[PDB]
Every structure is written in C-alpha cells, then in structure tokens.
C-alpha cells in the first residue's frame, strides 16, 4: 500500500501540511466531486489492493510506527511497532478479511477487542477529547507510547490517549481544513490545547454532513445541523456553501443523482 | 452619461458579446456581489449622476437611437433619435425628476402615457413575448422604427414591438447570461425566431429571483422558485448555486447580512 511519511521532530507548519496534502492526495482519486467536496472511494466494489494507506510515523526519539488508514472513511483500522501489529475489532467480516492483507510480515499480530470509535476509546482512556491535549508534543509522546505497547511499557488508559490523539491530528484533519488549520496554529506557537466545541461538533458530525451534503436538494440541506462554534454557541447549517471550506473529504453516502 | 455603442451591421457573435460586457461593466460597480452574483446599485442615495448609462445603436441603413437605461435595475426609460426624446410614464415623482436630466439638448421631448412594462407593451402591440421574433434582423428592423416614430413613419403596434426587441436583446440579455447566450446562437446562425419558455419565465422571475437569493438562508431559498425549461417542463429551483451560471446581475433588494 502507499506510505507517507512524517516525523514530529523539528515539525514546522509546512511539513505538517505537505503531510496532510499527501495524506488526502492518497486517499482520494478525483473522480468523485460533489459541490466542490471530495467523495471518498466507495466500499462496494474497491479491490482489497486498494483498501488501505499506510501512515509512518517517526519522533524525536527515533521511534516509528505505521498506522493503517482505511480509504473509505480515513479512519485508522491498526498499526505495527516493530515485531508485532495490532488491529481495532472488525466491525463485520468483510473487513475482518480484509484487514488480514496488512502487515502480513509481522511475527506477532494481535486483534483487539474493543472497537477505535471515540466513544469507546474515552471510556478506556478515562478521559474525554475535550480533555486530552494535542500538538506536536501530544503527538511527540503518542508515537512513544504506541511503539512501548509492545514491550509492555505501556498501559491501556495511555495506548488509548494516544490512539484519541493520532486520529484527530491525521484522520480528522485530512477530514476537515479547519481541523487542520487548529493543528497548524498548535504549532506555529508550539502550543499543546485540548480541542474547542467546533472541533469536537465536527468530528462527531462528519457522517451526518456526508449525508447531508450528498442528499441536498441543489446544495439545500432538508433539515439543518447545528454544530458549535469555538466559544460553544450554536451554529446552524443550511447549505452546502458555508461549510466548502471546512470540510475536505466526504465518506460515501450515495450515487450523485 | 457614459454610451456604449453597438451596430447590427456586420454584427458577429463576438461583437455582440463584446457589447453586453461593455453594458455590464457599466451597469455594475464591483462593490457589491452576494453568491457570486453582481448586484445593481441601490436607488436611495444613488446621485443623478450616476443614475443612468446610454446605449448608441446604429442599423446597415446608418441610422441611430441613443436609449437611456436605469442603472439600478437595467431597463430602458427612454430614448432619442435626432429632434426628439421619448420617455415612458415614470413610475413615481422621483423617476419623474431623474429623468428630466436625460437628453437635455433635444428640442422636442416627449413622454408616453404607457409605462415600459411586458404586460402594457404586448396589449399595444398586439402581440405576446412568446410570438416576436428576436436576431439581429429584428433588432436591425427595431432601430429604424423606433427612428421613423420621429417622422411619423411608424404605428404604435411597431413602436411597442420594437421596443419589445430591443428590451430583450439589451436588459435582459445583461441580466441572464442564459438569455444572452439565446441571442449569440441567433447570431451564429443567423437565424429570427420567438422566445421559448425558458427565456420568458426567466425574464418574468428576474425580480422575485433577486430577492429570493439575497432573503436566502446562506444560499438555500425559503421557498422553491418554479422555472420553465425550454421544452415547457417545470424545474424546480431550491438553491441559488444552479443559478450562478444563469443571471448575471440582480436588482437590489436588501443590504447582504
């Protein structure tokens, strides 16, 4: 699968969005566009050898690891450190067999139990997104703690810190520009934040605004979303147009008509 | 006032298109587009000015008329040729005063009881939108009559449809860039023929599409707009996006949130 390549070390706001530029350069083909949005592949029909992106991720400690990213909603599915490579619980058979196409040259593979949607993880790591740092020092100590899970240094509350911080800074910030714009200004002043409202009511809506947007009478949403601005007032959304430059992918919801 | 000059004669579908750029530009200061779409200037507080550009046309058989249009909604008030000035019953005293500043050098000025509306100008001439020939050598034939109306030449049911020619192939192919493209393919191919359904429920909505798109909940209407296509069937507009490539400018309605 393609590999794109980061490191925190000496992280500029450049690299971080020559990074992201890839990452979604990666993940979409060009041919799907919907009022200036990219659709992300559609599941039905993709062939395994397209299935997945492999992100490596390198810290100034010299340690990688290589998180598997899923095409079809950027979300990520697993990742190796080193001997071994763990897997979030399939959520059905299809992609538990598709997952057995990643990594296949590590000696030891394990599958976790629990799934890698933010509700669980929160749970296991005793802590909510609004509470939980991120910058390039969050992410600095989130590939540390990834890498250590294999020798046993790490514990679970801290492997699901870090899995809450690496899917906000990549996953969602190829989702959304403006995510990506909050990361950006983190460090441009080296700063380390938990994420505002805007950001969290973003994240939990990416799905309904695929929808939403794919489902418009002409850009004209149904029914509105409400979402929150960074001091936690509400916002509604009505149509395709304001939302153009936020959000940066779309998961595949239907046919455009 | 600034003129803007156009002959029929040897006209091509680049000088024609050349024109309504120029009116336009004109008509247009830049200052003010909501959704990508030029709107007019606001009549309360516009200095008289600045109220009015003029549009020199000339025929193959060298003869010319100097219309005068509104530049807060593009229409045409009036007109001269030679002696004489011409202008339709102003709709309030303002418009009244306006245009007393129109062609102040004519010797004879005259002012119609009638106003220059579709619904007054078709019962005089006899004759719907949807039955007068629009081209070049309609235009060509608009010129001389609107001319001849000076010397006694030419009966109120030519003058009407006449100015039903030139309102169209003027005013309306400045508001739509869909009505303007009509009129380059008569060109093209030289051909005269009536006005399908599209152009006339266009020309007719030109008002309520301008306050449906600045009354619009960031771009979707409250209310759907119904249009005709050119085969006569309905179509349904819900948001101003798939208008964006068909009116060009809109009259001034409210100020942009």
Redesign the interface.
């Given at each position: 699968y393609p590999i794109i390549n980061f490191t925190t070390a000496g992280a500029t706001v450049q690299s971080y969005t020559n990074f992201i530029r890839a990452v979604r350069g990666r993940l979409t083909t060009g041919a799907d566009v919907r009022?200036e949005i990219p659709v992300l592949p559609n599941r039905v029909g993709l062939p395994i050898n397209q299935r997945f992106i492999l992100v490596e991720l390198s810290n100034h400690a010299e340690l990688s690891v290589t998180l598997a990213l899923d095409v079809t909603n950027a979300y990520v599915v697993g990742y190796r450190a080193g001997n071994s490579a763990y897997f979030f619980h399939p959520d059905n058979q299809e992609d538990a067999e598709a997952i057995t196409h990643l990594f296949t040259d590590v000696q030891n593979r394990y599958t976790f139990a629990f799934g890698g949607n933010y509700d669980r993880l929160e749970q296991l790591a005793g802590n909510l997104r609004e509470n939980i740092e991120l910058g390039n020092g969050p992410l600095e100590e989130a590939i540390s703690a990834l890498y250590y899970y294999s020798t046993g240094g790490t514990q679970l509350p801290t492997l699901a810190r870090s899995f809450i911080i690496c899917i906000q800074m990549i996953s969602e910030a190829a989702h959304f520009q403006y995510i990506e714009g909050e990361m950006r200004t983190r460090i441009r002043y080296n700063r380390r934040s938990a994420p505002d409202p805007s950001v969290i009511t973003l994240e939990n809506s990416w799905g309904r605004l695929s929808t939403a947007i794919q489902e418009?009478?002409?850009?004209?949403?149904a029914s509105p979303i409400q979402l929150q601005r960074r001091n936690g007032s509400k916002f509604s959304?009505?149509?395709?147009?304001?939302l153009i430059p936020i959000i940066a992918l779309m998961v595949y919801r239907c046919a455009p008509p």
């Open positions: 009022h418009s009478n002409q850009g004209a949403f959304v009505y149509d395709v147009s304001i």
